[PDB]
Amino acid sequence: SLVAARPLVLVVDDNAVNREALILYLKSRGIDAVGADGAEEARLYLHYQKRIGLMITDLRMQPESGLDLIRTIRASERAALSIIVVSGDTDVEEAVDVMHLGVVDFLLKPVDLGKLLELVNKELKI
Amino acid sequence: VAARPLVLVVDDNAVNREALILYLKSRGIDAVGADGAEEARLYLHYQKRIGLMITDLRMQPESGLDLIRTIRASERAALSIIVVSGDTDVEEAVDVMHLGVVDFLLKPVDLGKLLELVNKE
Amino acid sequence: RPLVLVVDDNAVNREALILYLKSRGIDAVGADGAEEARLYLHYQKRIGLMITDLRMQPESGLDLIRTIRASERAALSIIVVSGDTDVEEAVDVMHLGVVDFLLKPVDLGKLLELVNKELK
Amino acid sequence: PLVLVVDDNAVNREALILYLKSRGIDAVGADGAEEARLYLHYQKRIGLMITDLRMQPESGLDLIRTIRASERAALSIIVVSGDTDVEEAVDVMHLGVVDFLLKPVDLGKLLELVNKE
């Protein structure tokens, strides 16, 4: 539409400490953010809050992994959703699978925050 | 006739520390980070110029309260301390306030309020 | 002879702490709230210590302590004993320089210790 | 329709060429990034390139970048790699390769090729 809705980032991680740290970092840089504790809460947020324009997710999550969450997103009405992966332990095959799913980027933890913010600003046009 | 402020940011999470360090720095206040009580003390030993410490309570093996106690029993006893705490309770907040902290804020922190306390200190 | 003022809008809790203090050699009197507490402090100069709850209607223990710190009796020793609070209110109150902040069920040994020391 | 196969290892390069050609698919080989660029430049029938990542002076990733900066930017490229890592795979996947396969090779790769032409 002619003027963008205010940006909202969904941060998905089953680690509450990290989830909250990243929300704080995004907010300290003037970017609104909300958190989901796994794939099910992520799909809820996406369904009921249309303002979300970007999702940041870990791959390493219980009970459902970041890769499975991404797959269901790409098969849904929110298939065009911008996604940045910030991952714990992973491997080449999984990274290639995720990249075929069209993510904006795939970063390894400990996250490079300056690079993360560049990707977020660019995707959100800020 | 002139000098320059430095803040020590103590937390058990690197992103939290960085969020605060960047926020201060982007507002003309120098800051460094320590990942726990042992590193906090190292910075305090080797870096004067440190005029204020922002710490969490929730850290392991040594807690924020333990850290503050050791500081109040040291040559750095008058150090300005702000607490920005994760989960805590009334009796711990009271123990901490007895030790002389400047203020005690709960996470998720109100950064505008934080800055205001920092500026005044 | 020093007096302790006990402030609580709960008459039953109030009278039971005053009786306990007396049992321990400590004279004490009661106020049922902020307004009665300030009037007692105003005219009864024997009062060297005040014990107050935070949960009181129509004026809170927090508001009470603020009016005291804004007054000629700003230096009054004050102990808070509260059944019903939170970290943020406890911080607001400690900012006001209370001797201590005890949760209920009150540790009577700790309280009497605080009381004896503050009265000297 | 011609497949360029790029690898500084002659056994793997020849095996894959011979394999493809012994199926319905013509194929030629290069042994490094310089030679691949040479064939890409002069041999216009090349419609798909299979490359490794570990090569001599210029890497497979550096090769792909020079191709994406060029008139041959649309070239279909399949990567087949042995010694790699997550950050390199992501770097390469950002350059739009058809697929990125770990060694040891296979033949579901032939599946990949015929898919492409």
* Cβ neighbours of residue B57 closer than 8 Å, sequence gap 6 or more: B63, B64, B65, B83, B85, B86, B88, B92, B96
Assigned token pair, D80:
């087949």
Smallest Cα distance from B87 to chain A, Å: 11
- Closest Cα partner for B97 from B82, B78, B79, B114? B82
B 35-74 residues inside an 8 A Cβ radius of A: none
Coil vs helix vs strand at A89: coil
Instruction: List Cα–Cα distances, C69 to B29, C38, C66, C76, C87, in angstroms.
Output: 34, 11, 5, 8, 21
Contact A19, A13 (CB under 8 A): yes
Which residues of chain D make contact with A99, given a CB cutoff of 8 A? Answer: 89-90, 93-94, 100
| C82-107 exposure pattern, b = at least 16 Cβ within 10 A, e = fewer | beebebebbbbbbeeebbbbbbeebe
- Closest Cα partner for B36 from B66, B6, B15? B66
Coil vs helix vs strand at D31: coil
Burial class for A60, CB neighbours closer than 10 Å (0-12, 13-18, 19+): middle
| Residue entry with tokens 């809705």 | A5
Q: What is the rounded CA–CA span in Å between residue C4 and residue A50?
A: 61
Q: Which residue ranges form the domains of chain A, and what is each CATH number? A: 1-126 (3.40.50.2300)
> Which ranges of chain A would DSSP assign to H, the alpha helix?
16-28, 39-48, 66-74, 92-100, 113-123
Angle, helix C87-95 to helix C61-69, in steps of 10 degrees: 20
Q: Identify the residue among D79, D86, D91 best suited for mutation to test binding to A, counting A beta carbons within 10 A and taking the highest.
A: D86
Angle, helix C61-69 to helix C34-43, in steps of 10 degrees: 30
Does C100 lie at the interface with B, CB-CB under 8 angstroms? yes
Which residues of chain A make contact with D93, given a CB cutoff of 8 A? Answer: 95-96, 99-100, 106
Which residues of chain C make contact with B97, given a CB cutoff of 8 A? Answer: 90-91, 94-95, 101
Q: What is the rounded CA–CA span in Å between residue C114 and residue B94?
A: 15
The DSSP line for chain C is --EEEEE-S-HHHHHHHHHHHHHTT--EEEESSHHHHHHHHHH-TTEEEEEE-S--SSS-HHHHHHHHHTSTTTT-EEEEEESS--HHHHHHHHHTT-SEEEESSP-HHHHHHHHHHHH-
Subunits with 3+ C-beta pairs closer than 8 A to B: A, C
Residue D29, φ and ψ in degrees, nearest 5: -120, 150
DSSP bridge pairs for C103: C82
Q: What is the rounded CA–CA span in Å between residue B95 and residue B100?
A: 9
Q: What is the rounded CA–CA span in Å between residue A50 and residue D7?
A: 48
Coil vs helix vs strand at B9: strand
Q: Do B109 and A24 touch (CB under 8 A)?
A: yes
What does R_g of chain B's alpha carbons equal in angstroms?
A: 13
Q: Give the resolution to one decimal, in Å.
A: 2.1
- What order do you get walking across the sheet with B6-10 strand by strand? B30-34, B6-10, B50-55, B80-85, B103-106
Assigned token pair, D64:
């792909």
Indicate the DSSP class of residue D100.
E
D84, D85, D93: residue with CB nearest A99? D93
Indicate the DSSP class of residue D47.
E
C3-7 and C47-52 strand pairing: parallel
Question: What's the start-to-end Cα distance of chain A, in Å?
Answer: 16
In chain A, the residue whose alpha carbon lies closest to the alpha carbon of B24 is: A28
> Around B28, how many Cα atoms within 13 Å sit in the side-chain half-sphere?
2
* Cβ neighbours of residue B24 closer than 8 Å, sequence gap 6 or more: B7, B9, B30, B31, B115, B118
Contact C50, C38 (CB under 8 A): no
